[PDB]
Amino acid sequence: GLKAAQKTLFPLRSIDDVVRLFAAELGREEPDLVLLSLVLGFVEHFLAVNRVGLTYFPVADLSIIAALYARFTAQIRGAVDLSLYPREGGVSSRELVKKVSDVIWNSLSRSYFKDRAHIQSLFSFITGTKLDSSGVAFAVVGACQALGLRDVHLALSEDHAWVVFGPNGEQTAEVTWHGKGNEDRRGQTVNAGVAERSWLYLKGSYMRCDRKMEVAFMVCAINPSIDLHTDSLELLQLQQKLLWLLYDLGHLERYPMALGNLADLEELEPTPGRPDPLTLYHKGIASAKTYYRDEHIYPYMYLAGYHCRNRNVREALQAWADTATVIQDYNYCREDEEIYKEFFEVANDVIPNLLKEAASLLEAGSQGSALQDPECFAHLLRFYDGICKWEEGSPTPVLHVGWATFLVQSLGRFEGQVRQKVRIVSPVLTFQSEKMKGMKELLVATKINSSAIKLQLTAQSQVQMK
C-alpha cells in the first residue's frame, strides 16, 4: 500500500539514494516508519549479516521492498480488527494498543537470543520473526501508524521503551519486556515507575516521540557491526549521513542520545565543515537541560567517554562528577541495574586505570597533571558524593566494600598537599551526601586512613572481633 510518490526514488543503489528516500519521507506529513525501517533492515542485512556478492551497495528494488511492506501490513491488518475498538475523538484506546502489542508479541519465534545484533528492524520481524526489546515497541508504533492510529507514539527512557497514546497523548502503555528475568507489565501504565523515581522512567522526564523522532530512533538503531572486531564502513557512513539529515531538519533537537551517537561517529570519522564532537556532546547536554530538566545520565557519560579516550583526565572527571550530580536525585530501584553497572565500571575500573597512568606520567615528569590539580580531586569527590546521595532513601543499597577498596586507592593517587587544597563547605565543594560529609576529615590527612574510609563508605558497623 505505498503511495505512488514514495515509489519514485526506487531502486536505491547507494547510500545517498537511501538518504534521498529519508529526506523525501521526512518532508511528508507523516513519514512512513514501516517503509523506512524495512529499507534500513534490508540494507543492514546485506551489509552486516550477509555480504556475499556485495560489490558496492545492496540494491533495494521496489519489487523486494513492496513485497516486505505488503507482508507487514497484511499481518497487522488481518490480525487487528479495528471495528472492534471504536475510536473516540480520533484517539486510540488501551485495549486497541494492547491488541497490537499482543499481535507483534505472538508473531515472534518461541525462543531466540533476545539481544543479538540486527534484530531491531521490521526486516528482522518479517524475515526472521525476531525482535529485540525496543524493536517490539518500535514495531507496535509502526503497526499503529499503518492502521491509521496517529496518536500512538514511541516513548523512550535511557534503557527502555514503551508507547504513549490517547487523549492529548497523555496515556502510557508497556508493550515490551525490560531486561532479563523481569516479569512483564504489558498493558499497564509507567506511573508506578515514575512515582518511585527510578532511573528507568527518568522521573517522567522521558522522551515522547513525534514521528520525526521515531525516524531518528530507527537511525540510531542502525547497527553497523559485522562481528566483535569489524564494522561496516557503509553502514557507519549511512547512519552518520542520516543523523546529519535529521540534525539539519531540527529533528535531533529533543534527542540527547542521538546527538551523542552522532558525536561518537564524528570522532571516528569527521565530516568536513560540521561541528566538533565536543560541540555535539555539549548540544546533547543542553538538549537534556532544556527539554528533560537535566534528568538524563547519558549526556554527561558520552562527554566523559570522549574525554577519557583522549586522556583529558580533568575533563573526564568533571563530566563524571556531572553524571553523579544527576543520579543523586534518583532512587536506585530494581531494574536500574544497567546504570549501576556503568557507575561501577567508572569508579572501579575506568578511573583507576586513568589515575594509574597519570601517576606514571607524573613520575615521568608531567606538568599540569590531573594528580596535581585540586579541581580534579574535587571532581573525584563530587562523583562519589552523588553516588552516596543516590543511595540515600533507595530501596536497595549501592555501595559495598568492593567500592571502598578502589576509593582508597583512587584517593591515594593524590598527594596530601593537593587534597588539602580542596575547600569542603557546609576549589570549593559542598557535599550533599551524609556519607561524604562524615568523610571530610579523612580525605585531607597526609596518610589515608584506609579502614576508616571503608567504614564510612559502607557504613559497616564493626571491625574484626579477633
Ligand SMILES: CC1(C)CN=C(N2CCN(c3ncnc4sc(CCF)cc34)CC2)S1
Ligand atoms: C554513554 C553511553 C554508555 C554510550 N552509549 C550509550 N547508548 C547507546 C545508544 N542508546 C540509545 N540511543 C538512541 N536512542 C535510544 S532509546 C534507548 C532505550 C531503549 F530503547 C536507548 C537509546 C543507549 C545509550 S550510553
